[PDB]
Amino acid sequence: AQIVTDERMFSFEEPQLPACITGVQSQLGISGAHYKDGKHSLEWTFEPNGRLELRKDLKFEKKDPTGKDLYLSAFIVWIYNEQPQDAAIEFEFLKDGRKCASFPFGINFKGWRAAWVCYERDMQGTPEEGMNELRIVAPDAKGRLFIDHLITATKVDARQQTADLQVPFVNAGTTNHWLVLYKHSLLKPDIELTPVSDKQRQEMKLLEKRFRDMIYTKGKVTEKEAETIRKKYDLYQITYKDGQVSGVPVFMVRASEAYERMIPDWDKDMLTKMGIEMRAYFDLMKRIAVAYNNSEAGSPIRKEMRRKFLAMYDHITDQGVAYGSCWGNIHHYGYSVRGLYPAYFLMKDVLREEGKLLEAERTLRWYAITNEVYPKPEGNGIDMDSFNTQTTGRIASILMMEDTPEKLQYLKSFSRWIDYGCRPAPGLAGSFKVDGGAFHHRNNYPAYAVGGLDGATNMIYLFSRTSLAVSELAHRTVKDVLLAMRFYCNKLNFPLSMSGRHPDGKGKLVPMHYAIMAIAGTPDGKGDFDKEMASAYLRLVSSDMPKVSNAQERKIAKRLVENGFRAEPDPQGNLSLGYGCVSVQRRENWSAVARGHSRYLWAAEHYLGHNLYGRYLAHGSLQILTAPPGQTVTPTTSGWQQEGFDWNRIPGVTSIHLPLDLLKANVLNVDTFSGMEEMLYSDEAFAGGLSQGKMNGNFGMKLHEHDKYNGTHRARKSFHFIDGMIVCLGSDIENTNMDYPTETTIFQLAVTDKAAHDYWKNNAGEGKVWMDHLGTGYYVPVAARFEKNFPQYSRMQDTGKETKGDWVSLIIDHGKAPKAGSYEYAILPGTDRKTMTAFAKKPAYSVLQQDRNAHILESPSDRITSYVLFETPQSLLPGGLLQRTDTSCLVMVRKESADKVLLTVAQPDLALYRGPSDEAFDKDGKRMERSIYSRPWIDNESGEIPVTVTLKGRWKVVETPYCKVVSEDKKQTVLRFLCKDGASYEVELEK
Numbered sequence: 001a002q003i004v005t006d007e008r009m010f011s012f013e014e015p016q017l018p019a020c021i022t023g024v025q026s027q028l029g030i031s032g033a034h035y036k037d038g039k040h041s042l043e044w045t046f047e048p049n050g051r052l053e054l055r056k057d058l059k060f061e062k063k064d065p066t067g068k069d070l071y072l073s074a075f076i077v078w079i080y081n082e083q084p085q086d087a088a089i090e091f092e093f094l095k096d097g098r099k100c101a102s103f104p105f106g107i108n109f110k111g112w113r114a115a116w117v118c119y120e121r122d123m124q125g126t127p128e129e130g131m132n133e134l135r136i137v138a139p140d141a142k143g144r145l146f147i148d149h150l151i152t153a154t155k156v157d158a159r160q161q162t163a164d165l166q167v168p169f170v171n172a173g174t175t176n177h178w179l180v181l182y183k184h185s186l187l188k189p190d191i192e193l194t195p196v197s198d199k200q201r202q203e204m205k206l207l208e209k210r211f212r213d214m215i216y217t218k219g220k221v222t223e224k225e226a227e228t229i230r231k232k233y234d235l236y237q238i239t240y241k242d243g244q245v246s247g248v249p250v251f252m253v254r255a256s257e258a259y260e261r262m263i264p265d266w267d268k269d270m271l272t273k274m275g276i277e278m279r280a281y282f283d284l285m286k287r288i289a290v291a292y293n294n295s296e297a298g299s300p301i302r303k304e305m306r307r308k309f310l311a312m313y314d315h316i317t318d319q320g321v322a323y324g325s326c327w328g329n330i331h332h333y334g335y336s337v338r339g340l341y342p343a344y345f346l347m348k349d350v351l352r353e354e355g356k357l358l359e360a361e362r363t364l365r366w367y368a369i370t371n372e373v374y375p376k377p378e379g380n381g382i383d384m385d386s387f388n389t390q391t392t393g394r395i396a397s398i399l400m401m402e403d404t405p406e407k408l409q410y411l412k413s414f415s416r417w418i419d420y421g422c423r424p425a426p427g428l429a430g431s432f433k434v435d436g437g438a439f440h441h442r443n444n445y446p447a448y449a450v451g452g453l454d455g456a457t458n459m460i461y462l463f464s465r466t467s468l469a470v471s472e473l474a475h476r477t478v479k480d481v482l483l484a485m486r487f488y489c490n491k492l493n494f495p496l497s498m499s500g501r502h503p504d505g506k507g508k509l510v511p512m513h514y515a516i517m518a519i520a521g522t523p524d525g526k527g528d529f530d531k532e533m534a535s536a537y538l539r540l541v542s543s544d545m546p547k548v549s550n551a552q553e554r555k556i557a558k559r560l561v562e563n564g565f566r567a568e569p570d571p572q573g574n575l576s577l578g579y580g581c582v583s584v585q586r587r588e589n590w591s592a593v594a595r596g597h598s599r600y601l602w603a604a605e606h607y608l609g610h611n612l613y614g615r616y617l618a619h620g621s622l623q624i625l626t627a628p629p630g631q632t633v634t635p636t637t638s639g640w641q642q643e644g645f646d647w648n649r650i651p652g653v654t655s656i657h658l659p660l661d662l663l664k665a666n667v668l669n670v671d672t673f674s675g676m677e678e679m680l681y682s683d684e685a686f687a688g689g690l691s692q693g694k695m696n697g698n699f700g701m702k703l704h705e706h707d708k709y710n711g712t713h714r715a716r717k718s719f720h721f722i723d724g725m726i727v728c729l730g731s732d733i734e735n736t737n738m739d740y741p742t743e744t745t746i747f748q749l750a751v752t753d754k755a756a757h758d759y760w761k762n763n764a765g766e767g768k769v770w771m772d773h774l775g776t777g778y779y780v781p782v783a784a785r786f787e788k789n790f791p792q793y794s795r796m797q798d799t800g801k802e803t804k805g806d807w808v809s810l811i812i813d814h815g816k817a818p819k820a821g822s823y824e825y826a827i828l829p830g831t832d833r834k835t836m837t838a839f840a841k842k843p844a845y846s847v848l849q850q851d852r853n854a855h856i857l858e859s860p861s862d863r864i865t866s867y868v869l870f871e872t873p874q875s876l877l878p879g880g881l882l883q884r885t886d887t888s889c890l891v892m893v894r895k896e897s898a899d900k901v902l903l904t905v906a907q908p909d910l911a912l913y914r915g916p917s918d919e920a921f922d923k924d925g926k927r928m929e930r931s932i933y934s935r936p937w938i939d940n941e942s943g944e945i946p947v948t949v950t951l952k953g954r955w956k957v958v959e960t961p962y963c964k965v966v967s968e969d970k971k972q973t974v975l976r977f978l979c980k981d982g983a984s985y986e987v988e989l990e991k
């Protein structure tokens with residue numbers, strides 16, 4: 001049966017020809033030899049310059065004059081050619097006598113090709129409402145064509161029609177990355193052609209082995225697997241008639257958009273529901289290709305799978321999956337075509353034997369848009385989504401080629417593309433950053449990074465230890481990103497604040513990335529294995545020879561253990577992500593992760609039905625990820641679950657406690673640069689941390705909630721990470737909300753097991769000293785309120801459905817509409833009762849100042865002075881050594897002895913733009929919501945900011961490109977730091 005029956009739809013399934021179709025100097029007939037729908041098509045056998053005339057009301061309708069409806073009326077056909085001709089058909093559309101619109105259609109192809117052409121945009125001339133004739137003018141030569149699936153005119157999503165070799169003129173304006181297969185296939189290389197050397201030929205052989213092993217591992221073909229294959233394959237009804245291939249027509253899902261304005265009950269996924277879509281088809285081909293490689297040479301099953309693969313190949317190529325073919329509409333083809341590339345690659349040698357390899361090679365190159373690899377990168381970094389989706393297809397298509405100089409040129413081009421793609425990207429752009437941050441949607445986004453890393457990681461390894469290897473810079477950048485991720489995840493899970501739009505506590509890092517990079521070798525190429533990567537890997541899969549599921553990962557892991565590699569100890573020290581506004585302190589097995597936001601970096605991503613209540617995720621959050629020594633750190637072990645969680649009381653934040661219906665994100669489409677999303681960045685540049693000797697550090701932020709919600713709410717918050725202690729300081733907390741209280745939350749923890757319930761039965765706890773059921777201590781000198789809510793009510797992050805759980809909370813109660821609120825408390829994770837009582841009697845720190853100007857603090861035992869300087873300090877700074885500062889910044893001083901001092905400085909202002917905050921103001925003076933994508937500075941290089949420090953006494957320093965001594969006398973020593981990227985710059989001082 002033909003899908004969709006309509007007066008405008010010509011499918012030729014009737015025994016007699018339609019009376020309205022007549023042929024001039026040509027013969028017409030119903031043929032069953034080729035068909036795109038039903039079981040028949042129109043055979044049009046023509047003499048030179050013969051016409052095919054369809055005399056019926058074409059039912060073209062002019063575009064909506066109001067502009068409300070953007071759909072354009074389109075003509076749609078499928079043409080079949082048995083004999084390719086270096087010529088073109090002309091399509092003519094006439095009202096009564098005269099032609100109004102026309103378009104050319106190339107016929108230099110074998111098989112089915114489509115054309116979706118919009119009357120108003122893509123056609124020559126001007127279309128008219130009421131035209132009632134279709135002419136198909138043949139070229140000045142004889143030949144034959146089969147016509148099927150002809151829709152005269154119907155309204156269609158105007159964005160989606162794609163150009164190819166048959167219709168290069170279609171949608172000339174578009175820059176849609178999905179639709180530019182033809183445009184970008186025309187691109188030419190700039191890397192010069194060279195012949196292939198013996199070493200280079202062996203290297204290409206090596207990339208193929210590496211790639212085959214990557215997508216495939218030898219296995220067994222079960223009787224069940226074989227029966228499933230036969231059942232799925234038979235439904236396609238692939239058969240041969242007089243040398244011609246036919247079978248059930250296969251479309252890619254979006255081809256349904258043709259019938260959108262045609263059927264009342266339209267379903268976008270109707271073709272998938274019919275088993276007629278491409279994903280299933282190419283999935284089966286992969287399935288069969290795998291089965292062939294898992295069978296003994298000369299066996300009946302191997303011959304059977306070889307036979308089935310080729311039959312499926314012939315049919316899909318006949319249907320139009322070939323070079324220079326885009327089926328009229330190709331948007332979002334990526335997902336349907338995922339199986340294509342591995343299926344064809346696994347079947348290289350057999351395709352060559354059949355004389356079909358060159359063809360196969362070209363179709364892969366076409367659909368992977370491999371020529372996009374030709375251009376010289378203009379800068380560092382590419383879209384994370386490129387690494388995520390474009391790597392597999394492109395590399396497979398290149399490995400399909402014969403060992404020719406053209407293949408080497410492609411390889412050189414591909415390596416160059418990956419190389420610059422991995423390099424530190426500027427601003428909020430690219431993929432990877434100098435400090436280890438990984439960007440997508442213009443912030444650090446682990447959930448997306450994870451997918452992008454798959455590509456980058458796999459391609460680095462593929463090209464590794466070879467003349468085509470990527471630069472040290474590219475290799476080290478990705479390595480550092482992975483090392484950072486291992487640091488801020490604990491053990492494998494993303495922290496809550498870094499969950500993006502999925503705060504479900506499920507997102508994890510991928511151990512594979514580490515194992516792949518371990519066998520990639522050191523970034524310089526001098527080491528066969530990467531030691532840091534290997535031991536990082538073995539920690540992440542440590543059981544507590546490891547146990548793993550994925551076959552190719554198990555192979556690598558076996559190699560690493562045999563080569564004597566052991567698991568990492570839990571990473572120690574301090575991380576500061578300038579790109580992402582995150583600081584992490586790590587001692588023992590625990591971690592403390594701080595996250596804020598700036599005028600460059602958004603607080604939280606809100607989508608429809610995703611992350612409804614996460615407004616406060618970056619309001620200076622501080623999550624403690626922990627577990628009893630010996631057990632793996634999990635959100636569950638760190639005292640977090642989704643059900644029952646008070647979304648207002650994100651650990652560490654200063655926020656106004658709202659009812660969930662008021663806390664929910666009011667998601668809007670704010671401008672043309674975005675969709676239904678909320679991504680709120682502040683108007684303050686001062687947010688970030690410093691990292692001293694990768695061991696300790698501090699964090700500071702000027703918190704300022706967006707005017708969309710509680711815009712009066714602002715605060716100065718700081719974190720000070722000294723050894724196994726995190727001291728939290730706050731001042732200048734203020735808002736004008738008199739309906740709901742402002743709170744900083746010391747901790748909010750889930751009570752799950754029996755032992756947790758028994759611990760809280762009467763635990764007071766004191767006193768100036770608290771200790772939870774997870775073994776972490778809290779020194780709280782200020783007045784604080786304790787809540788034991790068994791149970792506590794909340795809602796799901798996505799669905800909003802009511803959830804409950806047993807929760808325990810300690811909060812610092814600022815009033816309703818505070819004027820100048822403040823707090824001071826310290827967190828010591830993985831401690832004991834004894835240390836805590838001793839800490840209460842003699843705190844290991846002393847506050848030097850705590851106001852709008854600065855939060856300064858020292859620890860005599862650790863020999864450390866911490867400076868969070870919010871403003872230029874007009875006055876002599878406390879501490880004894882650091883006297884004055886040029887501009888608002890972060891400083892930390894460590895005293896080795898009276899003679900040796902370690903000085904470290906950071907400038908949290910990323911400086912993507914230089915002036916006052918980029919803002920669009922209201923009639924009343926409120927900040928207007930504008931999506932980050934709309935800002936013109938999002939790709940800017942981080943600006944250099946000079947920071948000058950004044951130090952007491954004579955000091956000698958070794959000069960660096962980033963640190964210079966400016967002025968010097970008997971009393972003072974001033975130094976100038978050249979700051980970038982929110983990075984931490986440090987120097988060693990000697991008296």
Ligand SMILES: [Ca+2]
Pocket residue numbers: 002011012013035036037038039040041148149
């Ligand atoms: Ca038909």
